């Protein structure tokens, strides 16, 4: 397949899949998700980093946020209520790779690394959708944080290597489907 | 060469609200310069036809798609699909309020009855045609059974029908009763993506846009004499409307508001390009909202709720959660249940 | 231990009677039933005899269940259906009491004294009160809640007990006003399925699936003890009566049994179960009467009357606001 | 591994698709609820009529996800509660070639493709979202047709033809090994 390397200054953008009205005939529009599902690989050295962020680039918040934490991964996401923390108990680093099972139903989501059981919970009551602006960015974030008291991680580009990315059921294309192409590279072999 | 009818066979009539021409062949309107309304998802524009002029009516709108108006109450409505959400305000783009809130998928089309000021919407999510009050009360799904697709809709108050559009799998063209009932099939052949549907008044025909087979067709209005008139030039059509002697059009491809003659096809123009997504289009003009008969007369014909034309007459009708009492009054199913 | 106390003399309580052995507290009055949802079925056995009593013929999904023995009543949550539910205690005239707001109703505790319903939703997160009949609802706690499963009341004390088995898996108390809200025991726990409070031994009884333990504390969660550390594969909720816990396993679809000091004494109850749930002991006993801190002011204040620390608290149904102390008015006059 | 089957047409297949694992989760066990479906699969068939995969219950009214061949065309149906709507699709299966299907529902709203054809978009009525399933997802056809009779004739056929290559939800099948209720397991005869 391929492997898209980060260096921690590494942020890349990509469009959630939109509607062709050309071949659907169908309205345009981009509504609040119902549901997201996230398959990735990873691995890496790295202790902290801030590796996924489906947002709304609003200073409001409405998140869904895959991040390091202590060599432990986090799912976290901001529906309009407040937020849930879903923390995988599996270390990130021993610099192999690993399998993420991101996925959330509205208020209920899950998270499974590599064979561990999945750690589920929901969002609080309320809202059960989130805001978007067709932006998906990976690697962490350009130093964009929306203004919202996140752990410190967040704040911090992710180092280490990806593939086999899976946004819902489509396979996604490293390379081709990036908007914001800042430089990029095949995973090093250590 | 008759814009409307010729009658003594040959000279030609105009119908009252216009005028004949130089041409003595051509219908004019009297009233203002006809004005084209339409929806840009992003705003709702107005141009002058043959003219440089363009103004910007209603701005920061998130998905504006289906628009009508209301000329003498000087309302017009759109429907947002982004936020699943109907509103109006004055014509001017002042006064915005929310109509529909609740239920809504895909509300991809409007109409707007003048004469009995009445609100019919449909929605392709819903897979429903919806009626209310112009504020958006007294709310009524008219028609679900068999609709897949509903986009285009078109009324005829003073015929008291309605017309519209399903581009789904099984493509059709409609028309019925405003209450819903006298319901029958216009067109179900050759029809893959009915996009867009308008009644010429005047000349007493019906035209719509197929987005698949590339075609603009005119029909009488029971569905006969059935003719493509625009089969060139149409990548993807989406709305559109007639005046005088001219259809208005919009198209994805192009990202342009077009123009043809009705009876002809050509004199094929570009009014505006580099739009941002036109949506659905209108001609804002008084002789295209005639002055008609109130069924319901003096508003006591109101009924309990709703008033709605049905064959030649009337009906009275019941909202949404609502049960039918003596066919004159309608009362909440929540009375009935404890 | 002598059961109850001993000030050597054993000292029997109200309601029960010393037994020959000096140390047994037999209970007064009818004999003991074990009432438990079979999730088709609630069914009454009694323990040491071989027993079947169909209670409720025909369900989606029953768990949570509980009674209120004076008055004669059953109630119990349907987690498919969303909906709890309430009959009188021979099976008669099926009621619906809460319809609506519910995902996952893990929980259900019937205030004997107050005639009031606590109940906890591991999906909405959320504990909430209402009366016998379903009315005056009102949401209690629900911030920091996760998966709050098994419930239990001191009425008496006006304290409410919970287990939450969500990431943070913890054991907490509050006033039945929801204040006073403290740990119990918030370590060395995964999976707190269920809880039971001794009133007349004045202890607590847990059971955690993950750690397949059942322990006793003290009733403020002092002198924490495993009283059971094997034969626990699966086990859902748990009771208590005189010297003996009885406890529902997933594993063995089974009711067990044993000695709530020593642990000994395993006992299956019965087996073959389709899917056993909540369970209760049926008797007078384990619903002692107590004073009624709300009772013969005004009734309910003027709505909700709700236990607080020493003393009692007026509360709003939602969709209400507080009108000074003793009053309260609907959301939308302001 | 063994990744091509023969279906004869009283090859009836089962696999858990999404049931509550109350053993490992902890869960309180009931019948799940589902917002979405999405599989994958090709298909190689001579064959007109007959039912390929089932998903949901076996039983009358309960709810359905069916993709079934009825007069020579692949067809998505399935019933939320509320009433059922039927998919089809443009292209003739019977080629005896390779095809690879692609079938997704969110909620009330459906797609089928088969091949490289414009997908055949349809929504369930309005009123249910959700598909309760006891996690039972079914390959080649079932014994007997859930009891509620509303059904076309062709549901009742079982699957002649071969499959591989099946993607439910997210995870790719393993036709051998996953298969909770299987007969004996031959790969496809005529490559
Ligand atoms: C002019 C006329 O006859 N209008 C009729 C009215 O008499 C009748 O009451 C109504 C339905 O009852 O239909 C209309
Ligand atoms: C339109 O007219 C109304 C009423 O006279 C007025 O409130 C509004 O300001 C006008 N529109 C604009 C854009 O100023
Ligand atoms: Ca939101
Ligand atoms: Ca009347
Ligand atoms: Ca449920
Ligand atoms: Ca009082
Ligand atoms: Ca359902």
């Keep these: 397949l391929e492997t898209l390397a980060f260096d921690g200054r590494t942020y890349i953008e990509y469009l959630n899949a939109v509607i062709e009205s050309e071949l659907t005939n169908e309205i345009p529009a981009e509504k609040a998700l119902q549901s997201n599902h996230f398959e990735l690989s990873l691995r890496t050295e790295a202790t902290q980093g801030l590796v996924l962020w489906i947002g709304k680039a609003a200073e409001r918040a409405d998140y869904m946020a895959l991040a390091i934490v202590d060599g432990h991964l986090q799912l976290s996401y901001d529906l309009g209520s407040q937020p849930v923390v879903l923390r995988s108990t599996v270390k990130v680093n021993t610099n192999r790779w690993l399998r993420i099972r991101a996925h959330r139903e509205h208020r209920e989501g899950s998270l499974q690394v590599g064979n561990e059981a999945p750690v589920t919970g929901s969002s609080p009551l309320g809202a059960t959708q989130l805001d978007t602006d067709g932006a998906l960015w990976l690697g962490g974030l350009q130093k964009l944080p929306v203004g919202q008291a996140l752990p410190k991680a967040y704040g911090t580009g992710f180092v280490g290597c990806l593939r086999d990315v899976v946004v819902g059921h489509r396979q996604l294309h490293l390379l081709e489907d990036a908007v914001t192409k800042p430089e990029l590279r095949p995973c090093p072999t250590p | ?338």
């Design chain 2, 1 to 338: 060469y008759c814009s409307q009818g010729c009658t003594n066979s040959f000279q030609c009539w105009c119908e009252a609200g216009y005028e004949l021409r130089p041409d003595r062949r051509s219908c004019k309107a009297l009233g203002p310069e006809p004005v084209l309304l339409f929806a840009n998802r992003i705003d709702i524009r107005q141009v002058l036809p043959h003219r440089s002029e363009y103004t910007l009516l209603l701005n920061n709108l998130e998905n504006a798609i289906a628009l009508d108006f209301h000329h003498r109450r000087e309302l017009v409505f759109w429907s947002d699909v982004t936020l699943d959400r109907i509103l109006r305000a004055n014509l001017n783009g002042s006064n915005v309020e929310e109509v529909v809130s609740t239920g809504l998928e895909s509300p991809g089309g409007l109409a707007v009855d003048w004469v009995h000021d009445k609100l019919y919407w449909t929605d392709s999510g819903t897979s429903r045609i919806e009626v209310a009050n112009l504020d958006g009360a007294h709310r009524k799904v008219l028609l679900w059974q068999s609709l897949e697709k509903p986009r285009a809709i078109a009324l005829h108050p003073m015929e008291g029908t309605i017309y519209w559009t399903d581009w789904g799998n099984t493509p059709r063209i409609e028309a019925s009763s405003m209450d819903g009932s006298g319901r029958r099939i216009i067109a179900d052949t050759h029809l893959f993506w009915p996009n867009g549907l308008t009644i010429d008044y005047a000349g007493r025909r019906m035209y719509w846009v197929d987005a698949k087979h590339h075609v603009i067709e005119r029909a009488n209005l029971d569905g006969s004499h059935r003719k493509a008139v625009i089969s060139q030039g149409l990548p993807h059509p989406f709305a559109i409307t007639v005046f005088e002697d001219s259809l208005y059009w919009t198209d994805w491809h192009t990202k342009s508001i077009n123009s043809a003659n009705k009876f002809t096809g050509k004199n094929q123009e570009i009014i505006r390009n580099k739009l941002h997504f036109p949506m659905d289009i209108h001609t804002l003009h008084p002789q295209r909202q005639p002055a008609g008969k109130n069924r319901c007369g003096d508003n006591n014909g109101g009924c309990t709720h709703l008033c709605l034309p049905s064959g030649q007459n009337y009906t009275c009708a019941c909202p949404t959660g609502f049960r039918k009492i003596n066919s004159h009054a309608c009362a909440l199913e929540v009375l009935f249940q404890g």
